[PDB]
Design an enzyme around this catalytic site. Structure first.
Site, short mmCIF file in Angstrom:
data_model
loop_
_atom_site.label_atom_id
_atom_site.label_comp_id
_atom_site.label_asym_id
_atom_site.label_seq_id
_atom_site.Cartn_x
_atom_site.Cartn_y
_atom_site.Cartn_z
N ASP A 1 0.82 -1.20 0.00
CA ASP A 1 0.00 0.00 0.00
C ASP A 1 0.86 1.27 0.00
O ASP A 1 1.36 1.66 1.04
CB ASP A 1 -0.91 -0.04 1.23
CG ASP A 1 -1.79 1.17 1.33
OD1 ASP A 1 -1.90 1.91 0.34
OD2 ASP A 1 -2.40 1.37 2.42
N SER B 1 -0.86 15.82 -11.71
CA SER B 1 -1.12 15.45 -13.08
C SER B 1 -1.36 16.71 -13.90
O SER B 1 -1.89 17.70 -13.38
CB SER B 1 -2.33 14.52 -13.17
OG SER B 1 -2.69 14.28 -14.51
#
Length: 330
Positions: free
Chosen positions: A35, A199
């Site tokens: 994770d 992004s």
């Protein structure tokens, strides 16, 4: 040194991925959820409340010659999905794909919430976010990657998740055969303890890419792609019959639909998520309504590039002094 381990979906939908990890001496092999959005390595164990264990493989520290109890230490964690676990703390030898760390904090669960009990395929979590998120008290402990870093040939690990198939976690090297084209690297902020990056925008199917900054985290422990409501609305508007259902808890669509791809930007590069990756199947057994794999982050407080996005790429987690993230198509 290096390590290389195969990671395998737990079910037919890629709800999560498990990776075998050797713990203790002699090795006790447990299948853990790697994770990159948390920083605790915790396991079902001989100390976990018996009624809360159902099919998982447990770690038994008393059978390990190298296990040491961290006196007085405790841990307690709560996850985004509202699941939780807590317990005490050992250190022991931990190996992943041939890479060995001695004295790794192995957090033994005394209590786990129902969603963990109910998932027989996951024996614990191995956190790969920054150690500042580690919940051990009174003294925070280091992640497997942090501990291994100085011994690795290069201070990196990579995630190569498969779509409906196995993939790979590598430590200490970049497998230049595992991706197409070049890797584009982008800046990371560690201010919140995550692999947080920005992004450069998105496209929906064959639409023209929209240049727009989207701050979010690379999170192998989250199934879906969670993005701002604007972006998510623009996506599902291109799917006939799609709608947001508050009773189901997100966007749903006719299971017969052909989903468009979704593109996210990494600098001037682009990662294309095929439409099929965004189909998470019937909302209930036998339904003709299907649950979408791109959902709104509104209410989460952060955007999450989970498995739906990451499995479309080869992802470099560069733990150099100034950390960065690298993305390539594959």
């Amino acid at each position: 040194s290096t390590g290389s381990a195969t990671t395998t979906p737990i079910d037919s939908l890629d709800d999560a991925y498990i990776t075998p990890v050797q713990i203790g001496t002699p090795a006790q092999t447990l299948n853990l959820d790697f994770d990159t959005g948390s920083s605790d390595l915790w396991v079902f164990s001989s100390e976990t409340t018996a009624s809360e264990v159902d099919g998982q493989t447990i770690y038994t520290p008393s059978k390990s010659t190298t296990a040491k109890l961290l006196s007085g230490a405790t841990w307690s964690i709560s996850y985004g999905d509202g699941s939780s676990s807590s317990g005490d703390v050992y250190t022991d030898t931990v190996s992943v794909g041939g890479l060995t760390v001695t004295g790794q904090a192995v957090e033994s669960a005394k209590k786990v919430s129902s969603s963990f009990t109910e998932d027989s395929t996951i024996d614990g979590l191995l956190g790969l976010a920054f150690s500042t998120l580690n919940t051990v008290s009174p003294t925070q402990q280091k992640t497997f990657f942090d501990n291994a870093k100085a011994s690795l040939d290069s201070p990196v690990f990579t995630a190569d998740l498969g779509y409906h198939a196995p993939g790979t976690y590598n430590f200490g090297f970049i497998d230049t055969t595992a991706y197409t084209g070049s890797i584009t690297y982008t800046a990371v902020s560690t201010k919140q303890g995550f692999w947080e990056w920005t992004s450069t925008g998105y496209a929906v199917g064959s639409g023209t890419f929209k240049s727009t900054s989207i701050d979010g985290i690379a999170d192998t422990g989250t199934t879906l792609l969670y993005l701002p409501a604007t972006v998510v609305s623009a996506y599902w508007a291109q799917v006939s019959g799609a709608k947001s259902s508050s009773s189901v808890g997100g966007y749903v669509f006719p299971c017969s639909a052909t989903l468009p791809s979704f593109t996210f930007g990494v600098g001037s590069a682009r990662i294309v998520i095929p439409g099929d990756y965004i189909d998470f199947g019937p909302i209930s057994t036998g339904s003709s309504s299907c649950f979408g794999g791109i959902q709104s982050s509104a209410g989460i407080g952060i955007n999450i590039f989970g498995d739906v996005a990451l499995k479309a790429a080869f992802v470099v987690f560069n733990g150099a002094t100034t950390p960065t993230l690298g993305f390539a198509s594959k």
